[PDB]
Design a protein around this nucleic acid. Structure first.
Ligand code: 7Q6
Ligand code: 7Q6
Ligand code: MN
Ligand code: MN
Lengths: 176, 178
DNA sequence: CTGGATCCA
DNA sequence: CTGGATCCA
DNA sequence: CTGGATCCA
DNA sequence: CTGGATCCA
């Protein structure tokens, strides 16, 4: 995995938006643009990137075993380092260089929690999570939990989630 | 794979050799591990004819020692290299009588002993049936204890035999478990 | 069935 | 802070 | 490698 | 309707 600039990251994401699909029992299902979310240091607009992180929103639980393991990227040369249902790491060829692409999956119901988790940075996530831990809550990429039971927040966006958790909303680049 | 297959008796002779030769460094103090706190487990305890490795469970008196026992293990006089080594699992490739074998070391705390022995004895298929049955009654059995809702259920038991009976199963000697 | 060592995310 | 993939145990 | 019950095309 | 997939303790 080589080092990328922000500008290169954005250009790679633009190329992938239209070209991600997966094979579901011998049928090629296209992944929709609205279900593809740039996360990690790219969403945070860091000028240096070690990789490109994309979150894929999966409409149904039964598709989890198919999406990342049978991933297709039309016309692009890549090799797969590790791949399960929730994280898949590809090495993509881009013009005499090799870049690390990380793909992650969230179910529709996990969406804002996954976006929050994968946006980071880690330092920010630790503060937030410790603050909720003190109130006996547990936050991860799948939900908010109290006593190992899911807390039913009824929210769509990452912004709604953050307000509902009782924290000051900050744009991805201003989180630290 | 790491090591060659051994006969049962080869495995036992290796265990007999190692019983009086395991030690660890506790801040430069070299402490011998007691034979009483070493239990042969895995296919050796089940008395299978051929073994793919040797599994030993080391019983550790106190929690503070877990960061020292396996990470600073010593087998004086024996030639070996390390595959992986943490506090709960250390795997070694040992030289015994001019062939290379895999030696698995595991640690259990004193309170965990009967659960650990049960875990590491196997066989795997047997353990899965036992655990599935307890899972259906909302328990979780592992090498550290029996749990109900991520909370330790303190059984008044000491040995593996007592544990297997208290869990509501028919006790079978290691070699009869399938 | 359940979890460890490693190296990430 | 909290969890995933790999290859085991 | 739960394994019988229950769901759903 | 029933059989393969998924549920659940
Ligand atoms: N809770 C938690 N989340 C973590 C962690 N590491 C990465 N993540 C999540 C948040 C990160 O923004 C995202 C991608 O991680 P990674 O690629 Se290692 O770092 P990222 O912030 O993108 O910067 P870069 O890729 O190093 O440029 O995954 C972590 O340790 N704990
Ligand atoms: N719960 C559970 N326990 C497992 C598992 N694999 C190994 N173990 C435990 C039980 C085994 O008897 C023990 C040693 O494993 P391993 O060395 Se892979 O098999 P073992 O029975 O010694 O046969 P051999 O080493 O192949 O001769 O560790 C497992 O999948 N689940
Ligand atoms: Mn990244
Ligand atoms: Mn073994």
């Amino acid at each position: 995995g080589g080092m990328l600039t922000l500008i290169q990251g954005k250009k790679i994401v633009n190329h992938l938006r239209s070209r991600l699909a997966f094979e579901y029992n011998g049928q090629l299902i296209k992944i929709l643009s609205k279900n593809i979310v740039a996360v990690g240091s790219l969403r945070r607009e860091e000028k240096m990137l070690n990789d490109v992180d994309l979150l894929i929103i999966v409409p149904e639980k039964k598709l989890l075993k198919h999406v990342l393991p049978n991933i297709r990227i039309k016309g692009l040369s890549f090799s797969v380092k590790v791949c399960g249902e929730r994280k898949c790491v590809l090495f993509i060829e881009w013009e005499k260089k090799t870049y690390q692409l990380d793909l992650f999956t969230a179910l529709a119901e996990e969406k804002p929690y996954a976006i929050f988790h994968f946006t980071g940075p880690v330092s920010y996530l630790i503060r937030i999570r410790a603050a909720l831990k003190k109130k006996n809550y547990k936050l991860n990429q799948y939900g908010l939990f109290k006593n190992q039971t899911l807390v039913p927040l009824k929210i769509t966006t990452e912004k709604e989630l953050i307000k509902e958790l009782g924290f000051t909303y900050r744009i991805p680049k201003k989180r630290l």
